[PDB]
Structure 1
Amino acid sequence: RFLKVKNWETDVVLTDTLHLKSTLETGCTEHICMGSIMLPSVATKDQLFPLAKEFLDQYYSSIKRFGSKAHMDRLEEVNKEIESTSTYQLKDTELIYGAKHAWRNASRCVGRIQWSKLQVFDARDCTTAHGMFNYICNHVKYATNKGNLRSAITIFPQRTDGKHDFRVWNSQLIRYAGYKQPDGSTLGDPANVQFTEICIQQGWKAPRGRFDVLPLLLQANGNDPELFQIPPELVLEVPIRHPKFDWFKDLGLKWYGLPAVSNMLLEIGGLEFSACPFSGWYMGTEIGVRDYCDNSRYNILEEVAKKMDLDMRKTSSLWKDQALVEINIAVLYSFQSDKVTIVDHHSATESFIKHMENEYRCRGGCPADWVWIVPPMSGSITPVFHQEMLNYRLTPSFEYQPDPWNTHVWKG
């Protein structure tokens, strides 16, 4: 009822009572743990008021006005609108709070120390794909800030019936294209091969190369989605060089500066915002470890080992590890030498322990997913490897949602 999490590198103990406020299910049971499952798993007017009530109760209990006059009137105000319209609308202030807390509660996010410095763009007045394009361009511009990156989210109209959903079909506003070849192999980013072919299917003219920035596929009010090309002046790219190995430029790699996920659902007081792209800045390992070295991604460990004069015969020469560190030194150096915001996994994971300490004190806990918080390289030399973490689902929250092309009743 008052659970303890320990750090085993520092012997520091924190006490979690925030998990008592938790509401949703985790997938684990008393007899099975599913903490390594990647994705474990239309609303009515009945379930909607407890969700509004619960949300409004914590919003007013956060501006030091819990149960007060304005809280009880807002409670009644929302109840009235949920009777009237079987839904309701959030105040601008409630939308900013909810969004910030969906990030605050993202247990898989190592970057949450910044959760309160989040710029919320209210795009709930949007109606067309072009409007979405415009809103997304201002999001990208703003969040990029000429390389001094700034956290932001853009919130398109909430789901209503379910057939009039706003969706960004891209998993991220800025992704490189992936193209399969005659010999089967993949140019560009293999992760996006399916989406890259959907864009061609909708009329995209592919410059079938490596780091081709994909177009946006924006669906408005449940209408069929439409392609828009982000002006390349808004797409900030960092070419990757090493601070020792001058052959590293010959590798000819680069990555975009702005990680901006667009395929997730924002949940606030029972309301579902099916299109809510949010962006921060990269932790280096996302690019250099996962993007560049996953077998099913850019898979460059082959070449980087070669040009380093590496023992590639034996598995036990650790040529894979050795090339992996060099790649991440290079990504970090390249981003910093261009004044493009980036964080290394030591600084990011120390920041998170520090953030974890703040939440357990002023909030009673911090939902955290160890499987996702520990970086994908050098796990145990970072402080989070040794940090016991309680995972649990608080709301407001970001939730996974299916790709739109599996669910969208087409017509055109």
Structure 2
Amino acid sequence: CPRFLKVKNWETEVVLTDTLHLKSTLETGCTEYICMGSIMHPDVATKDQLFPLAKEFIDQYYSSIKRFGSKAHMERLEEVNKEIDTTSTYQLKDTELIYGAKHAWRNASRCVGRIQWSKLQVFDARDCTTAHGMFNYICNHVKYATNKGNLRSAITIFPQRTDGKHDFRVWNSQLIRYAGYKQPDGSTLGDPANVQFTEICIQQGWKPPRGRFDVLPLLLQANGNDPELFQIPPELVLEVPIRHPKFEWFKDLGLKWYGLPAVSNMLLEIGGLEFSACPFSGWYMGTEIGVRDYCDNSRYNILEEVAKKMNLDMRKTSSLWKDQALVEINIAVLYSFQSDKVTIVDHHSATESFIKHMENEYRCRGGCPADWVWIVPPMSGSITPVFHQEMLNYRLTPSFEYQPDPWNTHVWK
């Protein structure tokens, strides 16, 4: 591979040079004859596999704190080697854990919000042993991150995988999500995305309210045990009823959303260590709710209802009635959040900040992996600066990875 790759911004003619891609560790799915860049997703490590992974990470940590080659560096290497040799694994120091989490985010090519990467509050929950303890940790996470509306990004890290039969998992894909109920008539109530997980909860004992916006309970698995249900205390769940600054009928749609986006189903990998439960949270970009959650056909699918109330010609698709309702819905989302003083960012601000971030990263780090397909917002793409920006995609480590859904792999006791 060539040492220097150029990326061009086609609207500023700015040219950046990437040297960081040379540190790439995982494969992208592409080959020389086929690009998989629009593909969504293209029993443990052994002593021999673990030795180089850990060293690679440790070196990186010590290079970051400008102590590379030092006494403390070599001592740490030796202490890790000893641990892998005697216990076929090792434990990260708190400094390394915090460093590693922050870098997993920094390395997240799909995330447009990475300018904030270094302000992440890390909660070390590696002493957790039970599902009740997980629940205490997650409740504290929510309260801290939510901060009465002034959201702060945070991550809670539960114990790493050992032999694979003792995994800690959050079965929820996000800590806060709304239920979906499938009706005998084929219709769906609530959020169609969450129907399957909702059914699991019900079988596990959950009594569902059966509404449009019912917050799902946590389904928590500690130490490879069967998962357990817990209701998040309602006062810890901050919510925003959606209204429109101009259209007084918009609040009559009975729409709301939750303030805290909190992905909880990903795997955090640091130095070959696998953290299968690591819920993290930031704050919403408006389009995530306004475009995807609300206007996707397989989600809340409300464009039509919003369109009727706006009195638009919905016969000729060339009237762009869909596009017009889409904009209003997104205006309303940003207005409701800002009015309740709940942190949110519009797609114009976020994308501008990312270009700044990316330029800084190329400058100080020699690159910034980015997944254009994910970085470009799902509305008004070309009128944001990321659309014209060439991006190189590559997988650095530490990182957040996908992992199979736990109900597909769990061995029920």
Equivalent residue, structure 1, for 2:231: 229
CA distance in 2, matches of 1:339, 1:185: 35
CA distance in 2, matches of 1:401, 1:41: 13
Deviations 1:303-344 (A, max 9, x none): 000000111011111111000000000000000000000000
What secondary structure does 1:14 align onto? strand
Q: 2:168 touches 2:224 (CA, 8 Å); kept in 1?
A: yes
Structure 2 residue aligned with 1:2, among 4, 8, 19?
4
Where structure 2 has 5 or more consecutive residues not aligned to the other structure, the ranges are none
Where structure 1 has 5 or more consecutive residues not aligned to the other structure, the ranges are none
Instruction: Tell me the TM-score normalized by structure 1.
Output: 0.99
What secondary structure does 1:261 align onto? coil
Change (3 A) 1:41 1:317: farther
The more displaced of 32-41 and 167-176 is: 32-41
Deviations 1:354-392 (A, max 9, x none): 000110011000000000000000000000000000000
CA distance in 2, matches of 1:278, 1:309: 41
1:197-212 equivalences under 5 Å are 197-212=199-214
What secondary structure does 1:9 align onto? coil
Q: 1:242 touches 1:333 (CA, 8 Å); kept in 2?
A: yes
Change (3 A) 1:2 1:41: farther
CA distance in 2, matches of 1:34, 1:281: 29
CA distance in 1, matches of 2:406, 2:334: 34
Runs of 4+ residues deviating >3 angstroms: none
| 1:203 Cα offset (Å) | 0.3
What secondary structure does 1:260 align onto? coil
| 1:95 equivalenced with 2:111 (yes/no) | no
| 1:182 Cα offset (Å) | 2.3
CA distance in 2, matches of 1:41, 1:242: 52
CA distance in 2, matches of 1:23, 1:48: 14
Equivalent residue, structure 1, for 2:188: 186
CA distance in 1, matches of 2:164, 2:238: 35
The more displaced of 308-317 and 263-272 is: 308-317
Percent identical among aligned pairs is: 97
Aligned-residue Cα RMSD (Å) equals: 0.9
| 1:302 Cα offset (Å) | 1.0
| 1:41 Cα offset (Å) | 17
Deviations 1:36-68 (A, max 9, x none): 000019111111011100000010000011111
| 1:123 Cα offset (Å) | 0.2
Instruction: Tell me the TM-score normalized by structure 2.
Output: 0.99
1:233-244 equivalences under 5 Å are 233-244=235-246
Q: 1:27 touches 1:41 (CA, 8 Å); kept in 2?
A: no
CA distance in 1, matches of 2:312, 2:391: 38
Deviations 1:175-196 (A, max 9, x none): 0000011211111000000000
What secondary structure does 1:241 align onto? coil
What secondary structure does 1:306 align onto? helix
Number of aligned residue pairs: give it: 411
Q: 2:243 touches 2:250 (CA, 8 Å); kept in 1?
A: yes
What secondary structure does 2:386 align onto? coil
CA distance in 1, matches of 2:258, 2:233: 14
Q: 2:43 touches 2:163 (CA, 8 Å); kept in 1?
A: no
CA distance in 2, matches of 1:126, 1:23: 31
Q: 2:175 touches 2:279 (CA, 8 Å); kept in 1?
A: yes
| 1:402 Cα offset (Å) | 0.5
